[PDB]
Enzyme design. Structure first.
Site, PDB file in Angstrom:
ATOM      1  N   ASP A 189      -7.893  11.315   2.120  1.00  0.00           N
ATOM      2  CA  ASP A 189      -8.008  10.136   1.341  1.00  0.00           C
ATOM      3  C   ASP A 189      -8.826  10.420   0.115  1.00  0.00           C
ATOM      4  OD1 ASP A 189     -10.756   9.585   2.226  1.00  0.00           O
ATOM      5  OD2 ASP A 189     -10.031   8.000   3.616  1.00  0.00           O
TER       6      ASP A 189
ATOM      7  N   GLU B  22       0.780  -1.242   0.000  1.00  0.00           N
ATOM      8  CA  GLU B  22       0.000   0.000   0.000  1.00  0.00           C
ATOM      9  C   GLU B  22       0.804   1.280   0.000  1.00  0.00           C
ATOM     10  OE1 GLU B  22      -3.634   0.390   0.257  1.00  0.00           O
ATOM     11  OE2 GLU B  22      -4.227  -1.583   1.087  1.00  0.00           O
TER      12      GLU B  22
END
Ligand SMILES: [Cl-]
Ligand SMILES: [Cl-]
EC number: 3.2.1.17
Length: 162
Positions: free
Chosen positions: A20, A11
């Site tokens: 985000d 990730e």
């Protein structure tokens, strides 16, 4: 090697606040800070969480720390899941890790969708399972990750992250 580096790799680690995809404040390895829309709130939470005046910036250890939580959460998700549980339990450290990896990326539900695979995994057919995931959109969508995760289920070593 450990799940933290494993995920650090799969990730990625951001060491400063970030909004985000859905506008939410996050940091480290997808560690979401607040759903609210105030930086001060993100900051506060961080600073709380981290145990100091981070100022939005953290270290990798801290990230680890934060991470170690998200992990705990995920596992609890797994075990609450009647499909994932049995599997989790059968698994060895590494393999669990690989599962947590997937879980981390597609959610407990998603991971949950792979019937055979889980079965096979449950039965110790690491290899077939792997073979089996290879044939999935997943495998085709984020191939680089999938490969490693896949190999991991097969090998049961960190061989793929070295
Ligand atoms: Cl960064
Ligand atoms: Cl399947």
């Amino acid at each position: 090697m450990n799940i933290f580096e494993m995920l650090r790799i799969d990730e990625g680690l951001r060491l400063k606040i970030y909004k985000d995809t859905e506008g939410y404040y996050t940091i480290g390895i997808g560690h979401l800070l607040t759903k609210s829309p105030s930086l001060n709130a993100a900051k506060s939470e961080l600073d709380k969480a981290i145990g100091r005046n981070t100022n939005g910036v953290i270290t990798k250890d801290e990230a680890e720390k934060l991470f170690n939580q998200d992990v705990d959460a995920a596992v609890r998700g797994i075990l609450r899941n009647a499909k994932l549980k049995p599997v989790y339990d059968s698994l060895d450290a590494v393999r669990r890790a690989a599962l947590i990896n997937m879980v981390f990326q597609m959610g407990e539900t998603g991971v949950a969708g792979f019937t055979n695979s889980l079965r096979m995994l449950q039965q110790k057919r690491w290899c077939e399972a792997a073979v089996n995931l290879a044939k999935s959109r997943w495998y085709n969508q984020t191939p680089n990750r999938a490969k490693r995760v896949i190999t991991t289920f097969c090998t049961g070593t960190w061989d793929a992250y070295k």
